[PDB]
Ligand SMILES: COc1ccc(C(=O)NO)cc1NC(=O)c1cccc2c1oc1ccccc12
Ligand SMILES: [K+]
């Protein structure tokens with residue numbers, strides 16, 4: 001079955017942040033308005049037996065002192081008094097400032113995403129679900145002891161850690177507009193978790209990594225050498241060119257790695273209508289949405305898959321995309337046609353989809369060959385280092 005993470009308190013917490021507001025409510029209510037919820041298995045967020053057990057789970061990646069600081073930041077923001085100078089310095093030492101500010105629910109908000117993605121991994125591990133969706137997760141920038149890019153706790157790293165510890169190999173695919181640096185870093189030294197981010201990169205663009213570093217392309221270290229893959233793309237790319245750019249890479253990674261699990265971050269900020277206005281992807285499902293192309297390809301592998309959210313700052317259009325991803329996942333996994341009306345159905349958030357109230361977003365639509373050569377060589381290097389068996393020419397012919 002296809003699972004999806006939600007719940008009443010989960011929804012409230014996922015809607016409690018200043019940056020993402022009620023986006024999660026729009027997403028889930030649009031899925032509900034399209035009558036998809038009866039087709040999906042509800043996966044409840046993980047809850048713990050004690051504070052100690054919760055800390056044990058979160059500090060499988062994050063440092064104790066960072067988790068302590070994140071909890072204190074929440075406590076301080078539930079009081080009226082300003083922070084002391086010492087507490088400002090403490091928060092600064094963990095980058096709990098600027099684009100990762102405090103707010104009254106910052107710890108509960110960030111922990112909720114972890115609860116959802118851990119429960120999603122568990123539902124895959126016990127084979128209750130073949131795919132699980134968590135549109136409240138995907139916070140790929142958070143580091144062991146540092147908040148980054150409004151990511152406070154890295155739910156992805158923790159879910160992947162649960163999957164590998166369940167030989168197990170995980171393929172991580174990051175479709176967000178931004179480089180998946182936190183996940184890449186967490187598994188930099190591990191050959192068992194292969195990470196692949198496609199993203200925009202350019203001078204001064206956040207977070208700065210996932211591209212040439214004379215410049216060299218770093219790709220992992222130690223026994224994780226060659227295990228971190230990146231495809232940086234110039235601005236303006238459309239559905240077809242993005243699809244042709246990542247399609248052969250995805251198929252090649254699946255053939256060589258033969259993953260036990262796939263984890264996909266599906267940040268919606270590549271949409272042409274995202275306020276970043278960098279890429280020109282759509283949610284169209286006949287030009288075919290690059291997102292839907294990638295998800296369909298990944299699901300064709302019949303590997304247990306975790307699908308996560310991430311960025312996406314046009315909330316109605318993020319809901320438009322992720323509703324289409326959710327329907328596609330049902331169709332591909334269950335073989336059951338999901339007919340989705342081109343008009344937004346009436347529901348509590350209907351007014352957010354004006355003026356036209358349609359499901360399609362409102363949009364009128366060499367370098368990559370060099371990257372393909374580089375990535376194919378890295379994959380050969382990864383397979384050689386890890387003594388993996390594979391037909392080099394069947395993979396080469398994909399490109
Ligand atoms: C450092 O920035 C990021 C780092 C990481 C990510 C990300 O998605 N990671 O995967 C995103 C940004 N910046 C923005 O989200 C942003 C970008 C443009 C406009 C807005 C933005 O937020 C807004 C909130 C309210 C109103 C407007 C906006
Ligand atoms: K990405």
Ligand SMILES: [K+]
Nearest residue numbers: 187190193227
């Ligand atoms: K790795």
Ligand SMILES: [Zn+2]
Nearest residue numbers: 176177178311
């Ligand atoms: Zn992003």
